[PDB]
Design a protein around this ligand. Structure first.
Ligand SMILES: [Zn+2]
Ligand SMILES: [Zn+2]
Ligand SMILES: [Zn+2]
Ligand SMILES: [Zn+2]
Ligand SMILES: [Zn+2]
Ligand SMILES: [Zn+2]
Lengths: 296, 187, 102, 186, 296
RNA sequence: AGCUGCUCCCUAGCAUGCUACUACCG
RNA sequence: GCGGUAGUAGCAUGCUAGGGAGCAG
């Protein structure tokens, strides 16, 4: 019950086939639910037929018959199509702005994250859509990785050496420092703390975080989160004001900060000065010298 | 309700009846263009009476789910209230006196009536009259429930501070007289 | 059945809210209290029937004084839409006769 | 409600049919007034109804508004009505002792504690000037609340004893005047 | 529930866009509500739609359907428009005198207090309209000034010297003897007494009323009141009677008050003599001489 | 600041039921 | 001339919902 992603209007409808379950206003929801592979809409109650044993869950076909929502094959005479005027039935039916060019959101919704072009559109759009694309991307990332081969090592080769078994029907993901797993210790009922470790060439050698001694029965996965919605943009709006706002002028500095003084002022005189850095130019020294310039 | 498909039809039926009324030729003029009008009767009855029921039912539904959204928000509000209260009273509780008595119990269970009696840090006494004051908490330290207590503050029924010198047998009739004594556990 | 007269008179004179000390704002309180006091009309003690009669007279006075406000403070002419049944004994006698209307 | 538009139409139709029954020619040419007329009562009773109950709906809305206004303005004035009521009631009681203490309080002499009822027990009264001292205190006996009290001690506004025979005309401008008598009931 | 400003008729309505919430007769309110920028009316209850989530607060659309006041887009049939006959529905629906010429009241009502003519019209009308205009003028004064610069002095320069910071997005008032601020001492929760001081050229110098020593964290604004409606006119009705009423004839006087005695009589025999004074003619000497002339 | 029971008044709605007027077909 | 149905108006009885009040244990 909040603003929709493309219109900033209070609605109550959510794409059922999306991953984020985003808010979409009535005409805006009509657009997205006819123009992509999102076929479901949920409101304060889910718009699904109530006749026992129905599993057709499109958007246009459903019919509202009072305290229920039907399909045309499920429909007593007193009704009205839930889809008319190009506008789905839901709260705040009037005061929704909608949007005609929503093919950008449509593509983001259908973006399955395979091509580079997916990332290109995901990085070319506007702000809250940036957020939606980002969180859909990370959610699809964890759908990707967790469902792959189980790290079920079923014996120990030697000191820091192991023998590997993995999931059947689903392949196994890389074993590199770019791919960090997480351990769970099986007992007669459930799992216990082990931690994150890495696998490499062995016959499996593990570059463990810390010392561990695991016998058989153990197996690993690379755990993840359940990423929730965000709040804020990628950056703050800029500034071109007259003051070093909120801080204190300087008395002391070391002359090795000579190249540091000239850029201290620009970062604090306006909202943000985005730093590019060649390798080993003194950036962290600069990032430490920030507090050196103003102890306060 | 004017943009319906049958407003134009009843309009043209009555318009032709008007044309023939300006004409006024035959008996079939009357019969027909009272029956061009008498056909456009069901239009403007059902199309303007079934359109008068769907809208009422739609309004019913919209009001109902407004109600349900509000009832769903108040639930989350009260959930947060209860959680904050529980976790707040949790942090006056987890001392070592509590664990000390709990681990001395053979099966983990203890009576609830002996937890404030053995682990509380502060005591409150309510005194009806001076004779009871002399026998319970006279002095500046007294013993109750197998421990030693040390007085800080005395107030009266108006929540005003009394000093221990005022409480006497001949000043007693000048005090609002339930007095409330507060003491701290001595170590 | 009939009640203690002091109970009804006390419910008349003493109230638990300041709004109930103006009669024209409710009136229904006195209609209900007069329903409770009808069977005192059959008592042999004459100072017991006077309670019911006092209640009916007071109800009539309150109705008149409420209607004579909208004609002066404003210019509203209220019509006595059968409100005259409340200050006659038939409406109250009907509540103790066996043929319901609950 | 007769000032409505369709009244003219209904009256026309009924007068025409009165003429038709006063002439009595046909059966369906007179049914003209009735095919013509039942339309009049389908557009005059269809419009002499909604406004007739609207007339009552309006009056009941305005009575409700008046009652809410009066109710909310009655409870914004409790502590003026209550005191006015109390003093009319006390006036019509007409008791001698109450009138005594109320008149005294009106001119300045007030007590400092609750008036005791036992033949023992103490009473303290503020006396602000000589004139009000003449009427009540003569000798060592006090007259208050239609009773007699025996004086025991007089002290000044300086909280120091003043002997009783000192209080007189000439020395009155010598004492910080709001004294306090202390008497016991006789 | 009191008499109107232009009619001396008890009403119960209130202009919703107004600031002083004035009392208006039904027809008189109709004039004012359709002839200015005052779009709402308040009664014992607010005449607003009870359809959940509506925001159209004009006057003419609203419809009454019993113990509720709707929109036309919010309407059940059995009703009556709240606007009819050039008279908004309310208590005293009969005995309201109204006024055909209320463009004086109307002008005062849309007087935004920028041109001289606003003052001129405020200063040319009659009594109760004048009080209305004056109190709206103060109310707009407090709206104007308090919503300007907070004085968040963030460091001290020297003795009676300060460094200035103040709010962004809204400009800052002048720092003169005509603009007196008032202090508040912020602690971990809220503010404490500081007092009213002045700022001047520094780098800010404060010509404070009394001694004070403030470190960083404090900030200043210029406090005001919440002015209530008044009770009385600017001046009393005049007199041309025979008596120096209520006073005691004179026996003693000083010969410096020779020019004073001749003017003492005129202030005494008639209601008011309006005092005009060139700079330093003994008006104060005269003003203390009234009691010198009449010691009672 | 509670749990029950009974009674009066006001508004809304639903179907039902009775009753009146108009139209169509048989 | 009657029946059936479809509309529109007025009237009662019953049920539900909401609000206001009174008594009893
Ligand atoms: Zn949208
Ligand atoms: Zn979707
Ligand atoms: Zn279905
Ligand atoms: Zn206004
Ligand atoms: Zn007016
Ligand atoms: Zn509305």
């Amino acid at each position: 019950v909040g603003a929709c992603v493309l219109c900033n209007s209070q609605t109550s409808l959510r794409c059922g086939a999306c991953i984020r379950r985003p808010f979409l206003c009535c005409k805006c929801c009509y657009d997205h639910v006819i123009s992509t592979s999102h076929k479901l809409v949920l409101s304060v109650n889910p718009y699904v037929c109530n006749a026992p044993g129905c599993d057709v869950t499109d958007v246009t076909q459903l019919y509202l018959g009072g305290m229920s929502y039907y399909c045309k094959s499920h429909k007593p005479p007193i009704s009205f199509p839930l889809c008319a005027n190009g506008q789905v039935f839901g709260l705040y039916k009037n005061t929704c702005v909608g949007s005609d060019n929503v093919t950008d959101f449509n593509a983001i919704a259908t973006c399955d994250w395979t091509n580079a072009g997916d990332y290109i559109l995901a990085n070319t759009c506007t702000e809250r859509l940036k957020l939606f694309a980002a969180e859909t991307l990370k959610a699809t990332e964890e759908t990707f990785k967790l469902s792959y081969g189980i790290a079920t090592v079923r014996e120990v080769l030697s000191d820091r050496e192991l023998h590997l078994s993995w999931e059947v029907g689903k392949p196994r993901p890389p074993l590199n420092r770019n791919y960090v797993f997480t351990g769970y210790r099986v007992t007669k009922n459930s799992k216990v703390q082990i931690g994150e470790y890495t696998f490499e060439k062995g016959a499996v050698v593990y570059r463990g975080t810390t010392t561990y001694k695991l016998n058989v029965g153990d197996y690993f996965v690379l755990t993840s989160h359940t990423v929730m919605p965000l709040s804020a943009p990628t950056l703050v709006p800029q500034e071109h004001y007259v003051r070093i706002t909120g801080l204190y002028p300087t008395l002391n500095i070391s002359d090795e900060f000579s190249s540091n003084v000239a850029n201290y002022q620009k970062v604090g005189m306006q909202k943000y000065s985005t730093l590019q850095g060649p390798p080993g130019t003194g950036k962290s020294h600069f990032a430490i010298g920030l507090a050196l310039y103003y102890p306060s | 309700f004017s943009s319906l498909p049958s407003y134009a039809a009843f309009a043209t039926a009555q318009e032709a009846y008007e044309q023939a009324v300006a004409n006024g030729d035959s008996e079939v003029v009357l019969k027909k263009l009272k029956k061009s009008l008498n056909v456009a009767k069901s239009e403007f009855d059902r199309d303007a009476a079934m359109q008068r029921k769907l809208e009422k039912m739609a309004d019913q539904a919209m009001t109902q789910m407004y109600k349900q959204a509000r009832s769903e928000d108040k639930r989350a509000k009260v959930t947060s209230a209860m959680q904050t209260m529980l976790f707040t009273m949790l942090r006056k509780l987890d001392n070592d006196a509590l664990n000390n008595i709990i681990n001395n119990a053979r099966d983990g269970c203890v009576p609830l009536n002996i937890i404030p009696l053995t682990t509380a840090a502060k005591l409150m006494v309510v005194i009806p009259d001076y004779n009871t004051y002399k026998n319970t908490c006279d002095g500046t330290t007294f013993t109750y429930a197998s421990a030693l207590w040390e007085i800080q503050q005395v107030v009266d029924a108006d929540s005003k501070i009394v000093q221990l010198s005022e409480i006497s047998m001949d000043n007693s009739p000048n005090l609002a007289w339930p007095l409330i004594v507060t003491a701290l556990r001595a170590n | 059945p009939y009640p203690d007269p002091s109970r009804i008179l006390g419910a008349g004179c003493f109230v638990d809210d300041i709004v109930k000390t103006d009669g024209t704002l409710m009136i229904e309180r006195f209609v209900s209290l007069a329903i409770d006091a009808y069977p005192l009309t059959k008592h042999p003690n004459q100072e017991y029937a006077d309670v019911f009669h006092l209640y009916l007279q007071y109800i009539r006075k309150l109705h008149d004084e409420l209607t004579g406000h909208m004609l002066d403070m404003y210019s509203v002419m209220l019509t006595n839409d059968n409100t005259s049944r409340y200050w006659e004994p038939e409406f109250y006698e009907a509540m103790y006769t066996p043929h319901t209307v609950l």
